[PDB]
Amino acid sequence: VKPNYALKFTLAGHTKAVSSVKFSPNGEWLASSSADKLIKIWGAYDGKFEKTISGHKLGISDVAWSSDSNLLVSASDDKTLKIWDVSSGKCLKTLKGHSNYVFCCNFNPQSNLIVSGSFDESVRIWDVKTGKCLKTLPAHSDPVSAVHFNRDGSLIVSSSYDGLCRIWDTASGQCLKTLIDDNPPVSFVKFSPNGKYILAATLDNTLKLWDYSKGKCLKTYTGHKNEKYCIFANFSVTGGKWIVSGSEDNLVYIWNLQTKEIVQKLQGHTDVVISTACHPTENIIASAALENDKTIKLWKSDC
Numbered sequence: 001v002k003p004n005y006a007l008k009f010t011l012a013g014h015t016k017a018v019s020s021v022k023f024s025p026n027g028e029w030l031a032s033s034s035a036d037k038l039i040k041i042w043g044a045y046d047g048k049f050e051k052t053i054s055g056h057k058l059g060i061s062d063v064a065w066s067s068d069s070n071l072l073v074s075a076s077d078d079k080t081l082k083i084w085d086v087s088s089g090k091c092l093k094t095l096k097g098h099s100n101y102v103f104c105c106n107f108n109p110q111s112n113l114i115v116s117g118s119f120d121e122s123v124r125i126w127d128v129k130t131g132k133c134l135k136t137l138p139a140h141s142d143p144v145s146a147v148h149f150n151r152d153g154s155l156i157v158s159s160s161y162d163g164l165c166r167i168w169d170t171a172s173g174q175c176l177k178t179l180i181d182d183n184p185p186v187s188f189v190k191f192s193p194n195g196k197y198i199l200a201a202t203l204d205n206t207l208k209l210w211d212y213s214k215g216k217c218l219k220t221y222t223g224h225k226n227e228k229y230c231i232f233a234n235f236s237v238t239g240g241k242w243i244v245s246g247s248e249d250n251l252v253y254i255w256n257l258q259t260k261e262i263v264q265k266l267q268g269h270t271d272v273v274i275s276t277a278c279h280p281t282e283n284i285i286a287s288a289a290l291e292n293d294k295t296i297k298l299w300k301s302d303c
């Protein structure tokens with residue numbers, strides 16, 4: 001009915017705002033990225049700092065794992081993405097093509113591809129092996145805030161400050177759908193685990209669950225504050241079925257997915273919680289905050 005997330009660890013080390021936290025698909029690791037130009041790896045269960053991965057010339061907005069938990073991709077203000085071998089810490093490829101800040105990135109399920117979104121208003125599809133750009137989608141007319149592959153990688157969902165959420169056929173690069181809604185900036189977008197729904201944040205303090213096939217809004221989640229930052233949200237699926245998001249009032253919000261009620265609010269951070277991640281098997285949340293805080297928090301619940 002209601003989760004009971006409690007603080008287990010506070011992870012200090014970043015020297016500027018943290019931008020993104022992600023659990024490795026194998027559950028073993030947390031990766032974090034920051035305005036400090038660094039990627040850090042931490043033990044998911046003991047919160048133990050593992051290593052720092054460096055190479056970007058400017059700050060990093062996003063980081064994402066390959067399906068085998070061996071590779072990471074990062075998205076940076078230096079206009080590049082970098083592909084990293086986590087075990088060695090080495091940059092395997094630098095992905096060059098965007099003409100401004102890169103804000104978001106993801107591997108596909110196979111992990112032969114990377115998708116990216118940029119201030120330059122494009123979505124790019126990259127070949128992991130060669131490090132070359134396969135497709136450039138003229139996706140939006142303002143900065144791209146988020147990009148995400150569906151369950152099998154056949155679709156890409158993108159969001160933008162232009163107020164649109166668009167769905168793309170990965171193979172052809174063709175737009176399959178623009179969600180019909182007002183047009184406040186769409187600050188975040190993610191497919192549901194089954195690929196049927198899309199969770200979308202807009203900068204009017206609102207999260208929406210969309211039915212992809214129908215192009216219809218099914219659920220709305222409110223009560224939090226989100227009018228300025230591109231705050232990441234999540235489907236929590238290991239215990240109760242929740243929606244999880246950071247907020248500009250420094251809290252982590254948790255809603256019941258079906259009823260839309262706020263079921264928990266997590267207090268502790270001292271700046272905007274820009275990023276949250278949900279562990280793939282345990283009832284564990286990671287959260288991260290902006291420059292007044294600079295820490296990552298790990299929380300655990302019984303359900």
Ligand SMILES: COC(=O)c1ccc(N2CCN(C)CC2)c(NC(=O)c2cccc(OC)c2)c1
Nearest residue numbers: 017018019020034035059060061062103143230
């Ligand atoms: C006009 O659009 C933007 O300026 C913009 C959009 C999305 C961003 N992301 C996208 C990915 N999230 C995980 C983090 C926030 C970000 N990145 C950040 O807000 C951000 C936060 C902390 C550190 C950081 O270092 C570059 C960047 C910026």
Ligand SMILES: [Cl-]
Nearest residue numbers: 154169170171
């Ligand atoms: Cl496809």
Ligand SMILES: [Cl-]
Nearest residue numbers: 192193194195
């Ligand atoms: Cl689902």
Ligand SMILES: [Cl-]
Nearest residue numbers: 150155195196
């Ligand atoms: Cl789908």
Ligand SMILES: [Cl-]
Nearest residue numbers: 234276277278
């Ligand atoms: Cl997650």
